[PDB]
């Protein structure tokens, strides 16, 4: 209301309204949470079918950036695809220049600088994405990071991105997060996603769960969720 056009200009009270408007763009996006255990990091995304036109296995927001790192994006999908390609490129340069796996702090700092560089100038807009970054290493343990649309990148035990950002972490934080291995945390994330928004505004949603840790020996892939089928036989027991 006065000056919020360019991404270079300041306000009479000193903040950039472009960055705020891009931050609350992801607020309308789907709910995506993440949490780590003592030997791994678990992702989970509330994903919704439009009406009946999807195929249940298209456009998966669970990407796979490096051999041990993947994203859990939410927001504008194509911008997240481009950012995932940039992250693949950065891990490519590191693997080509130093001969070992990228530490997640350095990767997150390069990605944060790339996002900040798209927030700086006036020709371009800030990104409309907010994503998660998990990892595991034998000499480092489990690491879960978090990048906002502005470019502030730091670490968590658990997080949530979407509508129910507070309404997930209200009952995320009552989890005994340290003493659990991630194979419990699979159905834990299942119940957390299943709590929020069963039928209220939309009609139907669908669950994806990504999975990295010591049990994959350092690999990162989606769970065989059909194996052990841990949502629904507990989701039907989570309504009471």
């Amino acid at each position: 209301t006065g000056y919020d056009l360019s991404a270079s200009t300041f306000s009479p009270d000193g903040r950039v309204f472009q960055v705020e408007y891009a931050m609350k763009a992801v607020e309308n996006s789907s709910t995506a949470i993440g949490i780590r255990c003592k030997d791994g990091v678990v992702f989970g995304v509330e994903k919704l079918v439009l009406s009946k036109l999807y195929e249940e296995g298209s456009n998966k927001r669970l990407f796979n950036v490096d051999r041990h790192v993947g994203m859990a994006v939410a927001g504008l999908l194509a911008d997240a695809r481009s950012l995932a390609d940039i992250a693949r490129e950065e891990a490519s340069n590191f693997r080509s220049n130093f001969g070992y796996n990228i530490p997640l702090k350095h990767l997150a700092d390069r990605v944060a600088m790339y996002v900040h560089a798209y927030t700086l100038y006036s020709a371009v807009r800030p990104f409309g994405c907010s994503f998660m970054l998990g990892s595991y290493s034998v000499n480092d343990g489990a690491q879960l990071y978090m990048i906002d649309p502005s470019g502030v990148s730091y670490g968590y035990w658990g997080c949530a991105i979407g509508k129910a950002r507070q309404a997930a972490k209200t009952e995320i934080e009552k989890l005994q997060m340290k003493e659990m291995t991630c194979r419990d945390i699979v159905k834990e994330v299942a119940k957390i996603i299943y709590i929020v928004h069963d039928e209220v505004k939309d009609k139907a949603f669908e669950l994806e769960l990504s999975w990295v840790g010591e049990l994959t020996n350092g690999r990162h892939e989606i769970v065989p969720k059909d194996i052990r089928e841990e949502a629904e036989k507990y989701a039907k027991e989570s309504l009471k």
Partner: protein, 191 residues
């Protein structure tokens, strides 16, 4: 000329002659042929001088900048990969006999070798220099797996002694370097 690096259980031990010559005249009688890069990782050079000096300065730059940005002590294999890239990129113009050694907290003492081509390999001991062929003759005779520090010092002492004695270009004085978890130990011997 003649440079040498032998690892043991606790750490590594380096060694070189000095005697940088040009043709048949000695230009310089005593030389720091081995070069600190980080506080725990060395490299010792041979071949041409300006090539290895410029490469060592740029590697010191890149490695110091990278290890400060990590806020962690660097790896040895990292410096070996950096020397590999810079050697391989200008093999048309460089003559580097760079041998990387150094103790590491994660992986202990390691020795890497980069000859005139630009390949990188891990070894338990290495030779280098034009007058290294001879102690390369008997380094597979006298060496024993699992030495102590003093056995490595006496071993490389006899080695660099005979290399300096036999080759015309080699000679000068013996410099040693001992890298372990404890400290960096340089000394100047003759005998």
């Amino acid at each position: 000329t003649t440079i040498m690096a032998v690892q043991f259980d606790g750490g590594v031990v380096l060694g070189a002659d000095s005697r940088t010559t040009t043709g048949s005249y000695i230009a310089n009688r005593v030389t720091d042929k081995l070069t600190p890069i980080h506080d725990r990782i060395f490299c010792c050079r041979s071949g041409s001088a300006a090539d290895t000096q410029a490469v060592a300065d740029a590697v010191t730059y890149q490695l110091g900048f990278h290890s400060i940005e990590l806020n962690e002590p660097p790896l040895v294999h990292t410096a070996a990969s950096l020397f590999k890239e810079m050697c391989y990129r200008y093999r048309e113009d460089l003559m580097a006999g760079i041998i990387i050694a150094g103790w590491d907290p994660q992986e202990g003492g390691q020795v890497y070798s980069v000859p005139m081509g630009g390949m990188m390999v891990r070894q338990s001991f290495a030779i280098g220099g034009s007058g290294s062929s001879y102690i390369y003759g008997y380094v597979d005779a006298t060496y024993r797996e699992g030495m102590t520090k003093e056995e490595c010092l006496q071993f490389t002492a006899n080695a660099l002694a005979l290399a300096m004695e036999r080759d015309g270009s080699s000679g000068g004085v013996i410099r040693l370097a001992a890298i372990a978890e404890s400290g960096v130990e340089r000394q100047v011997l003759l005998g």
